[PDB]
Amino acid sequence: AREITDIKQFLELTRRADVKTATVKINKKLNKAGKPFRQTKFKVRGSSSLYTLVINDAGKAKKLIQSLPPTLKVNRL
Amino acid sequence: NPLTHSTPKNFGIGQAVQPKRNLSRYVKW
Amino acid sequence: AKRTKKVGITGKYGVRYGSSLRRQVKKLEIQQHARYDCSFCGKKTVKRGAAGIWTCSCCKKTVAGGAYTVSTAAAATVRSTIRRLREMVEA
Amino acid sequence: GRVIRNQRKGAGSIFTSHTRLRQGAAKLRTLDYAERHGYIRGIVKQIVHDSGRGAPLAKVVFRDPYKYRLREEIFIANEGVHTGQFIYAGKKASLNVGNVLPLGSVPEGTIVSNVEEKPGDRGALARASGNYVIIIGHNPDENKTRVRLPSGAKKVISSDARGVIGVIAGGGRVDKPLLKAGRAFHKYRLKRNSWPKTRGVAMNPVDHPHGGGNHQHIGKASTISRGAVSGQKAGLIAARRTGLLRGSQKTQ
Amino acid sequence: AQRVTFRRRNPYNTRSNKIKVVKTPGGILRAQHVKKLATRPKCGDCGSALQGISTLRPRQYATVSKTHKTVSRAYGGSRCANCVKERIIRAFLIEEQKIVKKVVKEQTEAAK
Amino acid sequence: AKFLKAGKVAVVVRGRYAGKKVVIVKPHDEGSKSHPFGHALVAGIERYPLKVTKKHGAKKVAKRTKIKPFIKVVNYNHLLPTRYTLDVEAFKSVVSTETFEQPSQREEAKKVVKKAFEERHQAGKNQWFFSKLRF
Amino acid sequence: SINQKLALVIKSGKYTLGYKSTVKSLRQGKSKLIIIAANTPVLRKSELEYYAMLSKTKVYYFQGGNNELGTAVGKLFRVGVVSILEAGDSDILTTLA
RNA sequence: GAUGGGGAAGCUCCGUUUCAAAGGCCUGAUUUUAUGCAGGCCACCAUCGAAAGGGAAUCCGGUUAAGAUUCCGGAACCUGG
RNA sequence: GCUUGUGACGGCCCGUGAAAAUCCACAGGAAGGAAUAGUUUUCAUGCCAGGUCGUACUGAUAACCGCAGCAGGUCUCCAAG
Ligand SMILES: [Mg+2]
Ligand SMILES: [Mg+2]
Ligand SMILES: [Mg+2]
Ligand SMILES: [Mg+2]
Ligand SMILES: [Mg+2]
Ligand SMILES: [Mg+2]
Ligand SMILES: [Mg+2]
Ligand SMILES: [Mg+2]
Ligand SMILES: [Mg+2]
Ligand SMILES: [Mg+2]
Ligand SMILES: [Mg+2]
């Protein structure tokens, strides 16, 4: 339900006790006019709600997947 | 004398709420 | 152009009810529907709101009045009588 | 015979007053130490319509003398009063339109309404729209006051009886003809089931004294004894005279 | 034109049983039940819808925080700005005239 | 005579501190760049000190008598000028135009103004000033 | 009579019509004499009295409401309080006003 | 439509706030421990009466021979702790 | 444009068009209050729990009433060219 814009805030909710599961969605979108671009979405499950992020930049998409906790259950797609 | 004031109340019809008088003559036994 | 020679507001009733009862109703429907002048704010904004109740659009003061008018000949002559009787005592 | 219509009304099944939308009973303040010694001030919060009633009501708020709270009253609104005005109630109040005064304290020729028959009863005489009594001379002995009631009757009541000043609002309500039945229908809708009305001379004999016949006719004299009985009284009851009136009208 | 039903057993069209048509991700029209609109709270002096206060159905006001139900002033979510203004003047001028009364009224009984 | 002066009491009529007592410390009469209107600096009190009595003593008398003050810029339209008077030599050079437009600089004045008003209430001077106008 | 006095002021001398501008002229201290109609509300009538006694200005009461104080000064509108800044041709200071 | 009252030889009738002694609650002070007193108000006084009036809060997608705003999958929101 | 919801207005009355549960706010300042920590769960997050009964189908020229699978009678929502 809830969305986050800041990337520094999202890394804190990955280690907030109740948060066990997480997920990394890959999308295929387009912008401007001509050619398309590759988008990614990172979602975490709190007890009450789902916090999520929208990263259009393909460069920083690789850096965020590398920096997750070890015990967190990350499910691709 | 130092801080507290003397500002009276006026118990005389349509002004000030009447005080707790002795009403023993009017009790419905 | 002027629409009706005589009936005016009582035209709504058409041909019904008799001419004099329509003439009597024209007279009293001219009074109650009309705008009157306010005592406090000084504007022609007083309008009826049920028989006996007269309010001001702006300023919002309500006044108790007649059935089909703000003031009447019964209350007009009584206004001077209550004024005159007090002048014995006060003046 | 059957049981006549006018005998049926006493049981009050369908003949009761329709009283959903009413505002409340329209009394004066209860007589207390504040009203029979000095005076007491109230504000008129709003004036307002009341169902089945030609005059408007005033929701008038006082403050309680013996405990910290307010008190809301319902007065019959006089022709003159407006919202925000100060109504000054009690003995030592000036001769003003809207103030409530004891009949001893006013002078003669004074026009009051909503007046008590006996002191402390809270409203009794002159309560319809455009009505009033005239005080016509006093009596210092036995504190009694002589008045003129709306019918022309000349009564003598107590001087400690109270009475708000001025005539009652809604005067000249019966001037405008109703024209149609629909307006009569809606008038009675908020009072009581007494409309429309069938004539007795149009019924069969089981139903009335005036029933039957091979023409529509009353048959015997329509004036009836003071001491007839339930079922015989239908027509003119204890009529000392009858017919269209000639000479001078009204009471002397 | 894909037609639509009520979602609850009350089949009459009253104030509490209103309907809104709604397109869904299955791709069909569907009825949705609509709740009753909230009024604005009124001032208890003039009767004006008074500003800086939320409009909710009365039991909703329990869930909401304190900022949403008031303003920062004497008579917060109770009287409007013009009404408070006036009774501050009226409270002051009468109590100014109360001191001007007792200065003149005491001299009246003194010099007689 | 012109009554809006440095040593005069008033009653605020609008905005948070409405129905409270102040003193017009510096009347900037004929306009400005920021605040383009007839305005005035004020220095009154937010929380009034409570009714102390002869039953209370020592500790509770101190707690009942604590005056949280305030300072503001206010339009002449939002003040009632009154015939009462209060001196302004205790905090003339402290409160100024340069004092405002700085978060940290407002407290130093308030702590000096609090010192002036608490010194005035202890031993009865300006009773009308330290009593709530009731509405 | 007040009708002859206010007639000569409107064409030659200065004036101001209305509450917001009387109190603006009365706070500054430019007013010589303020006039107040009958039907004007009492709370405002008492505040104009209080602002006039601080500034030290006379308070004449016009016999009649705002609708006939407008015809008195010549304007085609209702006006409820008149402050006279500069008394021109007329002499409203010394006379009964 | 009970009660308190009053009628009626009685089956029962009247009346619902009435000419009646008409019933509940908050802190502490405590550290026998459970409530002994501090004192404050309230006189509001049965109860029944609407599956169309008033009323806290839920949506989508799937699923069966016959059930779903109730099951399954996901995502929500109230109320009392 | 059709169906529906809503907003500011205007007509009409000798008709001026329910109540109660329930929820909030203000005025008031009782009481408790701080510097080695209290006050806040009317800010955010987190933990627990939410009973009892109804829920299938018809709703009519065959599931209801009319002696019957009777040309009668029986309240209501959606609405394409
Ligand atoms: Mg007939
Ligand atoms: Mg008849
Ligand atoms: Mg016949
Ligand atoms: Mg006979
Ligand atoms: Mg017979
Ligand atoms: Mg015949
Ligand atoms: Mg319902
Ligand atoms: Mg029930
Ligand atoms: Mg099903
Ligand atoms: Mg079903
Ligand atoms: Mg079905």
PDB file of N, CA and C in Angstrom, chain F residues 1-4 29 75-77 79-83, chain G residues 20 24 26-29 47 50-51 53-56:
ATOM      1  N   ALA F   1      -4.668  64.012  21.592  1.00  0.00           N
ATOM      2  CA  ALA F   1      -3.249  63.542  21.478  1.00  0.00           C
ATOM      3  C   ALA F   1      -3.154  62.152  20.847  1.00  0.00           C
ATOM      4  N   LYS F   2      -2.013  61.875  20.216  1.00  0.00           N
ATOM      5  CA  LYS F   2      -1.763  60.586  19.562  1.00  0.00           C
ATOM      6  C   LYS F   2      -1.393  59.548  20.631  1.00  0.00           C
ATOM      7  N   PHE F   3      -2.215  58.504  20.755  1.00  0.00           N
ATOM      8  CA  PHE F   3      -2.145  57.567  21.900  1.00  0.00           C
ATOM      9  C   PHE F   3      -1.251  56.332  21.698  1.00  0.00           C
ATOM     10  N   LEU F   4      -1.039  55.911  20.449  1.00  0.00           N
ATOM     11  CA  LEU F   4      -0.155  54.772  20.152  1.00  0.00           C
ATOM     12  C   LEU F   4       1.315  55.149  20.382  1.00  0.00           C
ATOM     13  N   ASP F  29       5.146  53.209  12.287  1.00  0.00           N
ATOM     14  CA  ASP F  29       3.872  53.754  11.795  1.00  0.00           C
ATOM     15  C   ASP F  29       3.731  53.727  10.267  1.00  0.00           C
ATOM     16  N   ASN F  75      -0.393  44.170  13.667  1.00  0.00           N
ATOM     17  CA  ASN F  75      -1.086  45.266  13.004  1.00  0.00           C
ATOM     18  C   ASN F  75      -1.886  46.065  14.034  1.00  0.00           C
ATOM     19  N   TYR F  76      -1.972  47.378  13.837  1.00  0.00           N
ATOM     20  CA  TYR F  76      -2.794  48.240  14.693  1.00  0.00           C
ATOM     21  C   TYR F  76      -4.269  47.843  14.675  1.00  0.00           C
ATOM     22  N   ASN F  77      -4.744  47.373  13.522  1.00  0.00           N
ATOM     23  CA  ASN F  77      -6.117  46.885  13.382  1.00  0.00           C
ATOM     24  C   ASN F  77      -6.465  45.737  14.342  1.00  0.00           C
ATOM     25  N   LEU F  79      -5.422  45.334  17.504  1.00  0.00           N
ATOM     26  CA  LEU F  79      -5.203  45.745  18.902  1.00  0.00           C
ATOM     27  C   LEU F  79      -6.295  46.689  19.386  1.00  0.00           C
ATOM     28  N   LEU F  80      -6.625  46.589  20.671  1.00  0.00           N
ATOM     29  CA  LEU F  80      -7.469  47.576  21.343  1.00  0.00           C
ATOM     30  C   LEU F  80      -6.553  48.456  22.180  1.00  0.00           C
ATOM     31  N   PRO F  81      -6.390  49.737  21.799  1.00  0.00           N
ATOM     32  CA  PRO F  81      -5.587  50.622  22.625  1.00  0.00           C
ATOM     33  C   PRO F  81      -6.396  51.014  23.847  1.00  0.00           C
ATOM     34  N   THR F  82      -5.778  50.930  25.020  1.00  0.00           N
ATOM     35  CA  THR F  82      -6.470  51.197  26.280  1.00  0.00           C
ATOM     36  C   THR F  82      -5.774  52.315  27.059  1.00  0.00           C
ATOM     37  N   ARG F  83      -6.547  52.985  27.914  1.00  0.00           N
ATOM     38  CA  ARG F  83      -6.064  54.136  28.699  1.00  0.00           C
ATOM     39  C   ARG F  83      -5.060  53.800  29.817  1.00  0.00           C
TER      40      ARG F  83
ATOM     41  N   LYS G  20     -14.174  51.971   9.040  1.00  0.00           N
ATOM     42  CA  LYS G  20     -12.760  51.609   8.827  1.00  0.00           C
ATOM     43  C   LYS G  20     -11.845  52.817   8.665  1.00  0.00           C
ATOM     44  N   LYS G  24      -9.287  54.794  11.320  1.00  0.00           N
ATOM     45  CA  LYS G  24      -7.958  55.051  10.739  1.00  0.00           C
ATOM     46  C   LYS G  24      -7.567  56.531  10.874  1.00  0.00           C
ATOM     47  N   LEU G  26      -9.001  58.545  13.162  1.00  0.00           N
ATOM     48  CA  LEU G  26      -9.097  58.816  14.607  1.00  0.00           C
ATOM     49  C   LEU G  26      -7.913  58.235  15.404  1.00  0.00           C
ATOM     50  N   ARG G  27      -7.330  57.127  14.926  1.00  0.00           N
ATOM     51  CA  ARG G  27      -6.075  56.586  15.490  1.00  0.00           C
ATOM     52  C   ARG G  27      -4.877  57.502  15.196  1.00  0.00           C
ATOM     53  N   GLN G  28      -4.806  58.014  13.964  1.00  0.00           N
ATOM     54  CA  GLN G  28      -3.775  58.987  13.564  1.00  0.00           C
ATOM     55  C   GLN G  28      -3.908  60.319  14.314  1.00  0.00           C
ATOM     56  N   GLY G  29      -5.148  60.778  14.484  1.00  0.00           N
ATOM     57  CA  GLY G  29      -5.452  62.034  15.178  1.00  0.00           C
ATOM     58  C   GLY G  29      -5.654  63.213  14.241  1.00  0.00           C
ATOM     59  N   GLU G  47     -17.666  51.521  20.870  1.00  0.00           N
ATOM     60  CA  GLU G  47     -16.242  51.518  20.506  1.00  0.00           C
ATOM     61  C   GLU G  47     -15.822  52.849  19.893  1.00  0.00           C
ATOM     62  N   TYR G  50     -15.442  55.170  22.696  1.00  0.00           N
ATOM     63  CA  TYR G  50     -14.200  54.890  23.419  1.00  0.00           C
ATOM     64  C   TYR G  50     -12.946  55.341  22.671  1.00  0.00           C
ATOM     65  N   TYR G  51     -12.917  55.151  21.352  1.00  0.00           N
ATOM     66  CA  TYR G  51     -11.807  55.658  20.522  1.00  0.00           C
ATOM     67  C   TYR G  51     -11.817  57.194  20.410  1.00  0.00           C
ATOM     68  N   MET G  53     -12.963  59.333  22.855  1.00  0.00           N
ATOM     69  CA  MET G  53     -12.565  59.900  24.156  1.00  0.00           C
ATOM     70  C   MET G  53     -11.053  59.787  24.425  1.00  0.00           C
ATOM     71  N   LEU G  54     -10.405  58.758  23.868  1.00  0.00           N
ATOM     72  CA  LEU G  54      -8.937  58.632  23.914  1.00  0.00           C
ATOM     73  C   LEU G  54      -8.261  59.675  23.015  1.00  0.00           C
ATOM     74  N   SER G  55      -8.714  59.761  21.763  1.00  0.00           N
ATOM     75  CA  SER G  55      -8.213  60.758  20.803  1.00  0.00           C
ATOM     76  C   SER G  55      -8.691  62.193  21.082  1.00  0.00           C
ATOM     77  N   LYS G  56      -9.743  62.335  21.898  1.00  0.00           N
ATOM     78  CA  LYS G  56     -10.326  63.629  22.295  1.00  0.00           C
ATOM     79  C   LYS G  56     -11.044  64.302  21.120  1.00  0.00           C
TER      80      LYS G  56
END
